[PDB]
Ligand SMILES: CCCN1C(=O)c2ccc(Cl)cc2Nc2ncccc21
């Protein structure tokens with residue numbers, strides 16, 4: 001049939017969808033689930049290269065699926081898998097403890113840690129047919 | 130067996146692609162032709178809604194296929210078809226006469242007129258396999 | 260000859276300073292004492308309004324002078340004075356008992372309770388020369 | 390008898406004031422003028438060091454007085470003075486032409502170019518008594 005639905009970008013084995021507006025991590029997490037998708041999950045250097053290129057026209061922040069309760073907990077994706085250490089280093093204030101947890105976002109090709117209640121753009125991803 | 134090639138966005142009956150770099154209108158037109166495509170052509174409110182949504186995360190200008198020789202000439206797409214007046218209003222300095230004509234671009238949901246020799250990003254469009 | 264020293268914010272009858280790094284409550288209390296100052300003490304709605312405004316561009320937590328041994332003990336400032344109940348409500352896990360006591364912090368305009376050994380930024384305050 | 394008014398930070402020969410929220414460059418410029426002040430003007434490495442330190446607790450963008458009509462025009466401060474050579478490099482999409490001009494902003498210690506209709510925090514600066 002067709003690899004990706006309308007409005008989505010087909011890349012490799014996945015479909016990517018940029019959000020129309022800025023919402024908190026919980027709102028972005030919910031939006032992806034409603035479209036049978038998860039938030040952005042980076043599994044390879046090729047995935048990171050594609051995402052940095054697709055966000056090269058934006059100076060805005062983009063919420064990914066990586067998050068943790070506090071610095072004593074590990075960085076995990078929505079499905080419960082861990083982050084591959086070689087892919088990228090989470091910069092910024094990683095040692096801070098926020099009441100709604102610490103969520104990871106990508107901005108200008110770099111990944112930074114931040115409070116989950118902040119409004120930011122998002123990228124949803126799902127398997128391509 | 131598939132509506133659009135890789136890296137393109139499938140919408141309605143067209144495939145849309147954002148340009149890799151900022152070039153003048155003539156070079157932007159050439160780039161689309163090189164990918165078997167034309168510069169962005171907006172025919173409906175549903176096309177403008179989609180484009181504004183696709184460019185919502187960018188503060189950059191994106192060229193489209195609308196252009197004219199000078200203010201005394203009508204705004205026309207690359208194929209020669211005219212602009213539907215209800216779709217949108219072309220803002221900015223529309224009364225200016227540039228040596229390489231006046232080309233239109235979309236930025237932050239709004240359409241503005243500008244000199245065609247200015248470097249700007251672009252959106253290419255081509256028919257989807259349906 | 261001047262109300263506050265360099266890098267401090269002058270407000271009302273006090274000088275406020277944001278800490279250079281994130282440390283546990285005891286180290287944050289020590290840092291203020293080294294600058295001839297104490298941890299943030301909120302005595303009025305005007306003081307709270309100022310602090311929320313000064314921290315409006317930060318998503319980080321800031322320690323204050325409010326702390327208690329456990330939930331059975333009252334919330335008290337460093338000098339021993341109590342909290343005015345109308346000023347604000349301490350949110351979060353207030354019913355928890357930590358080995359180094361429970362310390363209060365302000366983040367995004369709201370006041371939350373937390374373990375005193377956690378590294379957090381802080382606001383120091385001292386009297387202004389008037 | 391006081392170099393800076395209440396709520397301002399005294400640094401060197403100036404007074405600095407952080408904005409309470411985010412507004413477009415024109416509104417930020419208006420706010421500073423209302424307080425007998427101008428948008429942030431960096432004249433030395435010591436001024437840049439102070440600003441980066443004062444914004445170290447924020448991952449948000451902050452507006453500065455540096456702006457230009459388009460890439461063919463020079464980067465100028467509000468008073469008309471040019472940008473000093475070895476202070477900083479303006480990063481990002483400097484080759485773009487926005488309808489409301491290109492205004493410079495500081496974020497995470499780095500200076501980037503951007504569209505002036507975007508809402509951002511701001512820093513006002515005026516001489517100290
Ligand atoms: C979630 C916030 C996204 N955002 C920026 O990230 C942003 C980045 C740079 C500047 Cl100067 C100003 C900015 N503010 C802003 N204004 C309007 C639309 C989006 C933005």
Ligand SMILES: CCCN1C(=O)c2ccc(Cl)cc2Nc2ncccc21
Pocket residue numbers: 061062105114118119120411448449450508509510
């Ligand atoms: C001018 C916009 C300021 N801003 C950010 O710059 C910002 C930075 C990072 C993230 Cl993840 C999300 C962000 N959005 C945001 N949400 C709430 C208050 C402020 C912000």
